[PDB]
Design an enzyme around this catalytic site. Structure first.
Site, PDB file in Angstrom:
ATOM      1  N   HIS A   1      30.754  48.339   5.922  1.00 30.30           N
ATOM      2  CA  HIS A   1      31.722  49.045   5.082  1.00 30.30           C
ATOM      3  C   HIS A   1      31.868  48.636   3.669  1.00 30.30           C
ATOM      4  O   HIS A   1      31.865  49.463   2.781  1.00 30.30           O
ATOM      5  CB  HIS A   1      33.126  48.908   5.659  1.00 30.30           C
ATOM      6  CG  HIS A   1      33.322  49.673   6.909  1.00 30.30           C
ATOM      7  ND1 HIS A   1      33.512  51.041   6.914  1.00 30.30           N
ATOM      8  CD2 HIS A   1      33.351  49.275   8.205  1.00 30.30           C
ATOM      9  CE1 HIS A   1      33.654  51.460   8.157  1.00 30.30           C
ATOM     10  NE2 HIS A   1      33.557  50.407   8.957  1.00 30.30           N
TER      11      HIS A   1
ATOM     12  N   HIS B   1      30.102  43.553  10.976  1.00 30.79           N
ATOM     13  CA  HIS B   1      30.140  44.997  10.766  1.00 30.79           C
ATOM     14  C   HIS B   1      30.988  45.397   9.538  1.00 30.79           C
ATOM     15  O   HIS B   1      30.580  46.209   8.701  1.00 30.79           O
ATOM     16  CB  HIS B   1      30.702  45.629  12.030  1.00 30.79           C
ATOM     17  CG  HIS B   1      31.100  47.062  11.862  1.00 30.79           C
ATOM     18  ND1 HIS B   1      30.188  48.091  11.861  1.00 30.79           N
ATOM     19  CD2 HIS B   1      32.315  47.626  11.651  1.00 30.79           C
ATOM     20  CE1 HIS B   1      30.826  49.231  11.652  1.00 30.79           C
ATOM     21  NE2 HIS B   1      32.114  48.971  11.520  1.00 30.79           N
TER      22      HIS B   1
ATOM     23  N   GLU C   1      31.194  56.199   9.251  1.00 28.63           N
ATOM     24  CA  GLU C   1      30.541  55.326  10.247  1.00 28.63           C
ATOM     25  C   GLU C   1      29.082  55.622  10.471  1.00 28.63           C
ATOM     26  O   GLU C   1      28.265  54.689  10.505  1.00 28.63           O
ATOM     27  CB  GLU C   1      31.229  55.395  11.629  1.00 28.63           C
ATOM     28  CG  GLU C   1      32.448  54.545  11.755  1.00 28.63           C
ATOM     29  CD  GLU C   1      32.113  53.077  11.591  1.00 28.63           C
ATOM     30  OE1 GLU C   1      31.164  52.529  12.196  1.00 28.63           O
ATOM     31  OE2 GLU C   1      32.809  52.452  10.846  1.00 28.63           O
TER      32      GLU C   1
ATOM     33  N   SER D   1      25.101  48.274   9.998  1.00 28.72           N
ATOM     34  CA  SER D   1      25.306  46.993  10.666  1.00 28.72           C
ATOM     35  C   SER D   1      24.644  46.993  12.031  1.00 28.72           C
ATOM     36  O   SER D   1      24.881  46.109  12.838  1.00 28.72           O
ATOM     37  CB  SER D   1      26.804  46.661  10.812  1.00 28.72           C
ATOM     38  OG  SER D   1      27.427  47.627  11.643  1.00 28.72           O
TER      39      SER D   1
HETATM   40 FE   LIG Z   1      33.700  50.504  11.122  1.00 31.34          FE
END
Ligand SMILES: [Fe+3]
Ligand SMILES: N[C@@H](Cc1ccc(O)c(O)c1)C(=O)O
Ligand SMILES: N[C@@H](Cc1ccc(O)c(O)c1)C(=O)O
Ligand SMILES: [Fe+3]
Lengths: 308, 308
Positions: free
Chosen positions: A174, A169, A214, A233
């Site tokens: 990110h 993730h 997010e 993700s």
């Molecule tokens: Fe995160």
């Protein structure tokens, strides 16, 4: 009395003694709960994060064959969706990540190499994190362009599932956006707004973070694309968020800040940003409504926060 | 001569003429001391508690916009921590509270609806309380599965702070645990142990109550979670209690009973319960060491205490 906040980048070292000491891998329904090797491996990563101090290179780790297999499964399955679902900034930088950071199905990139690459693009850097940081500490790091990053990987029994952030993730979700200059500025404003803010406003900024960093959607040309790390993700939610099912609303911080969300199912609605520069401007305006007896400035030359 | 204690559930009505008549809102440093509207609103809630009698539905009250705002701020800020910090029993029942009792940011739940829900789960019920009950009377109500509950809310000038229990603390802290059958049994044993006990033992039971019902930590899986009401309604101490800072000790009533505590700062140490059933068993054993010339039984069929 104003809550404490780091004034120099080294003070972020104080966060290690403030995390939740009882992690998710200790709960009975965690996929690796009954796996003692997994449990030990997780403690091993936590000790690395615990002893890390600003300025040190992040320790390199040799991942086991089983962990590499899990990474490969996630990487192959998600990569197929990027060219059509992910935003332009993501696709533009990915090839460079494959070429200089070792983003490939057979290799898990090491955080130190990734941190050096980010430093070269926008000055962002990573630091390994043990468990869960409070919202205040987590957002505070963003003020210094520092991202707290997990180094461990999800349990291999359910490669397409994780109840917590893990390395897949962090790196596929990110990292690629932190290499964009406007995104970097935008995420740093969120950080700056949080410094010394009252607890109830930290929760508002945490909610804005959730609906942008997010789970954000952004306008691109006349189309819509995903830039939120949680979307990028997540194989299933990435396809779902650009279908006709979810409700889309323009990003308006007064509304976004108080929107409720669930962490366990696909999001019923998403906020669409016009661009990262525009989102940055809105955070800055919103930040002026936060009751703080002062103003803050980051001085990238000395890596200190100036209080006005 | 054995101190008086209620033998039927209606006799709890005698407690109203035994509270501390000079409440905290009358002290110069209470957040609402200089607010005459607040002062009047507090008297209004006290008169409701004063005239309430067992068997009557608890009066419904229309909360002002300002009071609803304070509740909303507290509710939103605390809710973010429950899924990771609160015990399983808390999280399991919360959704039902949102659905049948109106636990939402925009609405303060009415005590009568909450009392009916509790009655359906474990037979626990609430009654509004004016000011501070002595320890003896307060613990005594637990013997009948009756919880004395405040109905007023803290002053809106400091939403994240209260020097006394208020409705946010009762509903977000106590109420959810009273819906669990084992917790209900456990808290009732404390009540039973107190009936007719000598004053010095009431203080010991009050100290055990403080370290369990108010500030308890419990084992869950291989993890540790909060179940104490004072922790669950306190944003700062909830995060603090599961960090590496406090000292944790196993619940041992002989030691817990004489431990000193401060009411004004975060707790330096907490006692960890194995489970509520186990805590219940320990209270029962401890209760056998209390010098009483008799034994007590609660008969849920007639709502009377039998003396043996
Ligand atoms: Fe995160
Ligand atoms: N904000 C979440 C966790 C979280 C933060 C940032 C990022 C991420 O993937 C997950 C919590 O406090 O529970
Ligand atoms: N035991 C405390 C007050 C108190 C009791 C029960 C509960 C709560 O939140 C607070 C006192 O006698 O001063
Ligand atoms: Fe309480």
């Amino acid at each position: 009395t104003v809550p404490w906040f780091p004034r120099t980048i080294q003070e972020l070292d104080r966060f290690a003694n403030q995390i939740l000491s009882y992690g998710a891998e200790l709960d009975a329904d965690h996929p690796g709960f009954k796996d003692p090797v997994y449990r030990a491996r997780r403690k091993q990563f936590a000790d690395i994060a615990y002893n890390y101090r600003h300025g040190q290179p992040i320790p390199r780790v040799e991942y086991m064959e089983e962990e590499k297999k899990t990474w490969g499964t996630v990487f192959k399955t998600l990569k197929s969706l990027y060219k059509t679902h992910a935003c332009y900034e993501y696709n533009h930088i990915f090839p460079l990540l494959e070429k200089y950071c070792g983003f490939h199905e057979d290799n898990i990139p090491q955080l130190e190499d990734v941190s050096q690459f980010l430093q070269t693009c926008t000055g962002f850097r990573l630091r390994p994190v043990a468990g869960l940081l409070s919202s205040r500490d987590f957002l505070g790091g963003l003020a210094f362009r520092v991202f707290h990053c997990t180094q461990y990987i999800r349990h291999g029994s359910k490669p397409m599932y994780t109840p917590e952030p893990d390395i897949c993730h962090e790196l596929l979700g990110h990292v690629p956006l932190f290499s964009d200059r406007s995104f970097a500025q935008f995420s740093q404003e969120i950080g700056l707004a949080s410094l010394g803010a009252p607890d109830e406003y930290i929760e508002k900024l945490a909610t804005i973070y959730w609906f942008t960093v997010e789970f954000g959607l952004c306008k691109q040309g006349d189309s819509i694309k995903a830039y939120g790390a949680g979307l990028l993700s997540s194989f299933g939610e990435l396809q779902y968020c650009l279908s006709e099912k979810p409700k889309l609303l323009p990003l308006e911080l007064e509304k976004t800040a108080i929107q409720n969300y669930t962490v366990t199912e696909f999001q019923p609605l998403y906020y669409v940003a016009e661009s990262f520069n525009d989102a940055k401007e809105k955070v800055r305006n919103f930040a002026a409504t936060i009751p703080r007896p002062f103003s803050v400035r980051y001085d990238p030359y000395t890596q200190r926060i100036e209080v006005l």
